[PDB]
């Protein structure tokens, strides 16, 4: 199981609108993170035999977190965090280290066209699996238990990869975000969980 | 104490509006996006109140006892219930504005509510 | 590809308005958080959206293309960029709708030959068999630099009156003066190339012949954006723009420069260009820099003086 | 197109006013961002709105058109430029409102054959079928030069009394002194040409006949703006104006001269004009320079002496 | 220390206003857009205060003890609580104005607040 | 060094004012619009100080040690803390005035502040 | 070189003042409105210095080395640091006066500054 870390510098922020008034999300879903990675190999093509040129990277695990302060504003929901930093962790085993590292440098935007994001540095390595009590900052699933004080937790709804095809709605999956609503920031939460990969001290929780 | 300061600033804006018969200073205060706009209104409203004081058309009083300000815009007699801000309230309010211009919008909304209630009763 | 980061200085400007309240026209602002020793401060700062820039770029491209004889759509000759979206739009131009998925590519090519703007700008057709085309030019929001501990931007309201001899006449306009920075991307390599898999359809030879002219026109259209011909309210509120810093990179692989929010953003992007060429096995990597505020540049860069030389070098 | 940059020196000035506080009449002020050796700063400086300049230009155009026999609207005959915005103006002039979109062109022509002011300065009608016409002359705010670290401008208040034999009469007036700069741009290739897309409508032959006279009048009307006949409070506060530098460029392609903020803005704009003509495939580019302060100009540039010679050359 | 300097300048402006019965110098100070206008008011207000000192109509005192300035004008008695600025306060204030003329508006707003509160209290007692 | 020169000129003006009991030279200095007016005051104030030196009514001293100038006028005793300007300070100050007459206003404002503080303290002790 | 000439003329005026114990020639020089008044003072001060030279009460010296002029008057000893003007300095100074009489005021202001500083130091040591 290989892991990779990437540091992104945002220009003005990201904007993803909720499916089904056009409110937006607080943090990008894993689908956008996988699509950004897939952009490095499928550049120039928009329809493959027809739902998306991204129904092939569906089994790559990804998480992301903030490192600065921002504000969520509806004026079409947007998340303004200019000059901020984003840390993205990719965990997978489908491809070797070289291919993941090459695709990691080829990220251009997160969400829509205006949400450009440069790349500052990357790291590649081998991860280890643990199950003891850990502290994490990345968001995880709803079914994961919590031992600490419930004070900085929010509930969101994301979709599986089934939504990659047009004319079809993805399955609804609940997610828990360790985020402060105003101002926008990230906080640490202690979880027990069953599977956690150590990617450099900042344990990533998946189930 | 922040709410008391905002309330005293709202009383000053309401007295200035009732005396001048103009909403323009309250509109400028409620739409302020900088400390410059807020501070300019705080001067201009106090300058209007100073003229009313010199003419004896604005005076402090008590009413059943609560502190109040009587305003004569001619026969149109108005009474605003509460205190006017102190120099320390203006200084502490300007410090609140340097942190968050929202407090100018809050004071403007309160001032317009005071003035509207008094104009309706009159 | 071509990537660019540009720094601007604008005074007494009102280009992008927002919803009017009462008798007031308001400017577009966004919230930012600034770090202080005491703590954090939330401030509202004027911005300019990325749609007006796209509209100006498309209008300039139309004007340049109609001079060289390149095909232009009927509804795009008029400055109404609805594009081939619904059946009513296709009825005026005279294009039959796609039959099924397998024929989709053909439809695209036909559209791609009847309107240049639908090619470079991109189009979307809603219906039973949708067709897509991503824009070849990518633009971002114009936000003033958050540098140091001070935001160099303001916003005031101005009072205006109309004179009449029989009073029975008052309005307000918001004006601003900031120090803007914006970045953009363009891919001249993908111009005149279809974006749908399948078998080649008759008519691609015309696109191959017109590729060079379309690329030249697309590159030329950047001059209007880099010269300051965007936005509105220019009849009575004409702004006063000026160029301070500019970095343009031409490569053969994906790359973007650093945002122009710091005082030293050219050295970083040059070093990152070198590092990225080292890993992505690139061959071509060139950087052109225009400097007017006297910030540090580095070594290994050709220094220009105006924007016209930049366009000439990009075309060459 | 004709694009110009002009520098003026004005002393003991008050032509533009804003809301008054107490017995004090205030002068319009705006924020400006200026660059110094220590970085960037924000200052508050007196300015003059461009709407006064537009009103003066339109009044001079009305006078010239009336003298030369060109048609002038009934409401525009009096110096009240409401144009054809409201229904009362249409009723007074006697023009039927447009019925649907297809009739809009006709309405525009009916407006365009009665008042030259509507043709040159544009107009707006709001209703079931809105009609728009952008102005053919573009101006901006009058800002003093942001040269060096010190702004060459000053503002103060003055004390005045009214005499009376039976006291029962005191006011203050704001007075400023500065070195103003401003730029302008007018497109004479679109004068007397309809802008709304549609079919041919009877009455365009008269417009084609009168196009030359309309263009000549529009060019002549710039003399008032270039001379100094604008602003209010001229009865008791007549200002002292003196031209210092002027650049005028005539081109067949879009172009914008450099703002008059730096001491060297003539050589730069001439070089930029030459390179822009080279790169944009133009066919006409001429420049005229009036200099009275002994600054660098360049080589191969026509040098004039007054403004009347420039107006005559532009007309010819 | 910047707030203490601004407060002492505001006390000087308030004393000058109460003694002269004219707001004109405070109006000029709060509307200043240049160091010239600020410095001219700082001289003119101190020149008014100097005349009040020479006439013994302006004097420093303590009141229950806080430092204060007694002002006698047109048979009215006023007391401003606080110190007058030092020469160093004027010089440091002029340096603050050379960086940002905002501090003149802050001092003017404080001075008018002091004067208004004192005038209101004096009219109520009469 | 410019501020030190201005401060020493302000001390000279304050000594001349306290000794002569006349503000006229400080008024002329602070209202100067030409190098002529500034230079004339610099002579006239030094001529007044020269008479006080010859009468032994103006003397340099140290006070707890800071340099000071003792001034005796009309039976009043004043002490101005600081140095008087050198010939080089007068020459460098005149060069500053030839660039910007603002420095005469700055020195005048400081001089009046010094004199006012000393006069207030002397009246309070009496 | 103009400042050096003015400084040497100021040294001559200061030596003449300290030796004669009279400000009258410096007063005449600083108030001059014509080349006649300036030239008359330049003669009269040099005539006073000539008497001091003949009596050996005025002598050139070096002091720690800087050029200086020792002056003995009424049992007081003074030392002016610098050179006296040459004949060429007087001629070039008179040409400067024929262009602008301002230079006489500048030299007079410098001369009085030199004399005042020396008189103050001599009284303090006594």
PDB file of C-alpha atoms in Angstrom, chain C residues 7 9-12 64 67-68 77-79 147 150-156 158-166 171 175-179 216 220 223 227-229 234-242 244 263 292-294 305-306 308-309 311-312 315, chain D residues 17-19 28-35 39-42 44 47 49-51 54 58 78-83 85-86 121 134-135 137-143 146 183-185 197 254-256 258-259 261-262 268 272-273 275-276 279-282:
ATOM      1  CA  UNK C   7      -0.260  42.319 -11.663  1.00  0.00           C
ATOM      2  CA  UNK C   9      -2.985  48.819 -10.709  1.00  0.00           C
ATOM      3  CA  UNK C  10      -6.399  50.445 -11.178  1.00  0.00           C
ATOM      4  CA  UNK C  11      -7.758  53.745  -9.831  1.00  0.00           C
ATOM      5  CA  UNK C  12     -11.295  55.179  -9.605  1.00  0.00           C
ATOM      6  CA  UNK C  64     -10.163  39.620 -34.997  1.00  0.00           C
ATOM      7  CA  UNK C  67     -11.267  40.444 -40.354  1.00  0.00           C
ATOM      8  CA  UNK C  68      -9.364  37.332 -41.502  1.00  0.00           C
ATOM      9  CA  UNK C  77     -21.699  37.781 -35.113  1.00  0.00           C
ATOM     10  CA  UNK C  78     -24.067  39.714 -32.896  1.00  0.00           C
ATOM     11  CA  UNK C  79     -22.516  39.975 -29.451  1.00  0.00           C
ATOM     12  CA  UNK C 147       0.499  41.045   0.905  1.00  0.00           C
ATOM     13  CA  UNK C 150      -2.448  45.766   4.942  1.00  0.00           C
ATOM     14  CA  UNK C 151      -4.985  45.394   2.129  1.00  0.00           C
ATOM     15  CA  UNK C 152      -4.409  48.101  -0.545  1.00  0.00           C
ATOM     16  CA  UNK C 153      -8.046  48.472  -1.583  1.00  0.00           C
ATOM     17  CA  UNK C 154     -10.910  50.848  -0.789  1.00  0.00           C
ATOM     18  CA  UNK C 155     -14.553  51.330  -1.747  1.00  0.00           C
ATOM     19  CA  UNK C 156     -16.609  54.522  -1.448  1.00  0.00           C
ATOM     20  CA  UNK C 158     -20.465  58.736  -4.828  1.00  0.00           C
ATOM     21  CA  UNK C 159     -23.587  60.896  -5.100  1.00  0.00           C
ATOM     22  CA  UNK C 160     -24.903  62.033  -8.492  1.00  0.00           C
ATOM     23  CA  UNK C 161     -27.814  64.258  -9.528  1.00  0.00           C
ATOM     24  CA  UNK C 162     -29.610  64.996 -12.797  1.00  0.00           C
ATOM     25  CA  UNK C 163     -30.743  68.563 -13.503  1.00  0.00           C
ATOM     26  CA  UNK C 164     -34.335  69.345 -14.488  1.00  0.00           C
ATOM     27  CA  UNK C 165     -36.232  72.617 -14.824  1.00  0.00           C
ATOM     28  CA  UNK C 166     -39.473  71.215 -13.322  1.00  0.00           C
ATOM     29  CA  UNK C 171     -28.508  58.089  -7.564  1.00  0.00           C
ATOM     30  CA  UNK C 175     -16.166  53.373  -6.833  1.00  0.00           C
ATOM     31  CA  UNK C 176     -12.951  51.591  -5.876  1.00  0.00           C
ATOM     32  CA  UNK C 177      -9.174  51.688  -6.344  1.00  0.00           C
ATOM     33  CA  UNK C 178      -7.108  48.548  -5.718  1.00  0.00           C
ATOM     34  CA  UNK C 179      -3.979  46.654  -6.799  1.00  0.00           C
ATOM     35  CA  UNK C 216      -2.778  32.666 -34.382  1.00  0.00           C
ATOM     36  CA  UNK C 220      -3.776  37.459 -30.757  1.00  0.00           C
ATOM     37  CA  UNK C 223      -3.738  41.318 -26.312  1.00  0.00           C
ATOM     38  CA  UNK C 227      -4.295  45.720 -22.403  1.00  0.00           C
ATOM     39  CA  UNK C 228      -7.385  46.352 -20.263  1.00  0.00           C
ATOM     40  CA  UNK C 229     -10.447  46.251 -22.534  1.00  0.00           C
ATOM     41  CA  UNK C 234     -16.521  52.769 -19.426  1.00  0.00           C
ATOM     42  CA  UNK C 235     -18.573  55.609 -20.941  1.00  0.00           C
ATOM     43  CA  UNK C 236     -18.541  57.799 -17.816  1.00  0.00           C
ATOM     44  CA  UNK C 237     -16.375  55.805 -15.372  1.00  0.00           C
ATOM     45  CA  UNK C 238     -13.437  54.941 -17.624  1.00  0.00           C
ATOM     46  CA  UNK C 239     -10.692  53.529 -15.363  1.00  0.00           C
ATOM     47  CA  UNK C 240      -6.932  54.139 -15.374  1.00  0.00           C
ATOM     48  CA  UNK C 241      -4.992  50.864 -15.546  1.00  0.00           C
ATOM     49  CA  UNK C 242      -1.251  50.206 -15.513  1.00  0.00           C
ATOM     50  CA  UNK C 244       3.474  46.409 -12.935  1.00  0.00           C
ATOM     51  CA  UNK C 263       6.432  40.267  -3.301  1.00  0.00           C
ATOM     52  CA  UNK C 292       8.211  47.695 -13.437  1.00  0.00           C
ATOM     53  CA  UNK C 293       8.009  47.705  -9.611  1.00  0.00           C
ATOM     54  CA  UNK C 294      11.653  46.662  -9.206  1.00  0.00           C
ATOM     55  CA  UNK C 305       9.488  46.033 -22.220  1.00  0.00           C
ATOM     56  CA  UNK C 306       5.922  45.948 -23.571  1.00  0.00           C
ATOM     57  CA  UNK C 308       3.356  43.565 -27.984  1.00  0.00           C
ATOM     58  CA  UNK C 309       6.805  41.956 -27.888  1.00  0.00           C
ATOM     59  CA  UNK C 311       2.632  38.471 -28.250  1.00  0.00           C
ATOM     60  CA  UNK C 312       5.164  38.498 -31.101  1.00  0.00           C
ATOM     61  CA  UNK C 315       3.362  33.703 -31.997  1.00  0.00           C
TER      62      UNK C 315
ATOM     63  CA  UNK D  17     -19.579  69.777  -5.506  1.00  0.00           C
ATOM     64  CA  UNK D  18     -21.015  67.162  -3.161  1.00  0.00           C
ATOM     65  CA  UNK D  19     -23.426  67.110  -0.212  1.00  0.00           C
ATOM     66  CA  UNK D  28     -15.413  65.806  -4.197  1.00  0.00           C
ATOM     67  CA  UNK D  29     -12.652  63.554  -2.850  1.00  0.00           C
ATOM     68  CA  UNK D  30     -11.649  60.005  -3.749  1.00  0.00           C
ATOM     69  CA  UNK D  31      -9.100  57.447  -2.535  1.00  0.00           C
ATOM     70  CA  UNK D  32      -5.997  56.743  -4.601  1.00  0.00           C
ATOM     71  CA  UNK D  33      -3.301  54.077  -4.259  1.00  0.00           C
ATOM     72  CA  UNK D  34       0.186  55.477  -4.835  1.00  0.00           C
ATOM     73  CA  UNK D  35       3.599  53.806  -4.978  1.00  0.00           C
ATOM     74  CA  UNK D  39       5.864  50.525  -0.727  1.00  0.00           C
ATOM     75  CA  UNK D  40       2.219  51.375  -1.410  1.00  0.00           C
ATOM     76  CA  UNK D  41       0.010  53.915   0.355  1.00  0.00           C
ATOM     77  CA  UNK D  42      -3.611  55.072   0.273  1.00  0.00           C
ATOM     78  CA  UNK D  44      -7.537  60.968  -0.158  1.00  0.00           C
ATOM     79  CA  UNK D  47     -11.181  64.760  -7.961  1.00  0.00           C
ATOM     80  CA  UNK D  49     -16.330  63.689 -12.054  1.00  0.00           C
ATOM     81  CA  UNK D  50     -16.528  62.967 -15.768  1.00  0.00           C
ATOM     82  CA  UNK D  51     -20.256  63.646 -15.964  1.00  0.00           C
ATOM     83  CA  UNK D  54     -19.858  64.975 -20.706  1.00  0.00           C
ATOM     84  CA  UNK D  58     -23.022  67.719 -25.123  1.00  0.00           C
ATOM     85  CA  UNK D  78     -33.023  73.212 -23.613  1.00  0.00           C
ATOM     86  CA  UNK D  79     -29.925  72.066 -21.721  1.00  0.00           C
ATOM     87  CA  UNK D  80     -31.681  69.095 -20.108  1.00  0.00           C
ATOM     88  CA  UNK D  81     -30.281  65.771 -21.336  1.00  0.00           C
ATOM     89  CA  UNK D  82     -33.017  63.404 -20.194  1.00  0.00           C
ATOM     90  CA  UNK D  83     -32.956  62.098 -23.810  1.00  0.00           C
ATOM     91  CA  UNK D  85     -35.541  57.473 -21.175  1.00  0.00           C
ATOM     92  CA  UNK D  86     -39.055  58.032 -19.798  1.00  0.00           C
ATOM     93  CA  UNK D 121     -23.893  60.186 -26.639  1.00  0.00           C
ATOM     94  CA  UNK D 134     -23.683  53.064 -26.088  1.00  0.00           C
ATOM     95  CA  UNK D 135     -22.077  56.500 -26.145  1.00  0.00           C
ATOM     96  CA  UNK D 137     -17.426  59.404 -26.571  1.00  0.00           C
ATOM     97  CA  UNK D 138     -15.745  57.961 -23.477  1.00  0.00           C
ATOM     98  CA  UNK D 139     -14.320  60.050 -20.627  1.00  0.00           C
ATOM     99  CA  UNK D 140     -13.140  59.409 -17.084  1.00  0.00           C
ATOM    100  CA  UNK D 141     -12.516  61.033 -13.734  1.00  0.00           C
ATOM    101  CA  UNK D 142      -9.999  63.877 -13.569  1.00  0.00           C
ATOM    102  CA  UNK D 143      -7.178  62.753 -11.264  1.00  0.00           C
ATOM    103  CA  UNK D 146       0.538  60.355  -9.038  1.00  0.00           C
ATOM    104  CA  UNK D 183      -7.774  60.885 -21.024  1.00  0.00           C
ATOM    105  CA  UNK D 184     -10.550  60.579 -23.592  1.00  0.00           C
ATOM    106  CA  UNK D 185     -11.536  58.377 -26.570  1.00  0.00           C
ATOM    107  CA  UNK D 197     -29.294  44.338 -35.617  1.00  0.00           C
ATOM    108  CA  UNK D 254      -8.065  49.850 -30.860  1.00  0.00           C
ATOM    109  CA  UNK D 255      -5.359  51.606 -28.856  1.00  0.00           C
ATOM    110  CA  UNK D 256      -4.952  53.331 -25.498  1.00  0.00           C
ATOM    111  CA  UNK D 258      -0.375  55.814 -21.459  1.00  0.00           C
ATOM    112  CA  UNK D 259      -1.873  57.847 -18.593  1.00  0.00           C
ATOM    113  CA  UNK D 261       1.176  60.069 -14.503  1.00  0.00           C
ATOM    114  CA  UNK D 262       4.869  59.709 -15.404  1.00  0.00           C
ATOM    115  CA  UNK D 268       6.440  55.191 -24.556  1.00  0.00           C
ATOM    116  CA  UNK D 272       3.702  51.272 -28.337  1.00  0.00           C
ATOM    117  CA  UNK D 273       1.687  52.744 -31.219  1.00  0.00           C
ATOM    118  CA  UNK D 275       4.592  48.189 -32.367  1.00  0.00           C
ATOM    119  CA  UNK D 276       0.796  47.834 -32.148  1.00  0.00           C
ATOM    120  CA  UNK D 279       1.498  43.500 -34.762  1.00  0.00           C
ATOM    121  CA  UNK D 280      -2.224  44.148 -35.351  1.00  0.00           C
ATOM    122  CA  UNK D 281      -1.963  44.555 -39.160  1.00  0.00           C
ATOM    123  CA  UNK D 282      -3.177  48.146 -39.238  1.00  0.00           C
TER     124      UNK D 282
END
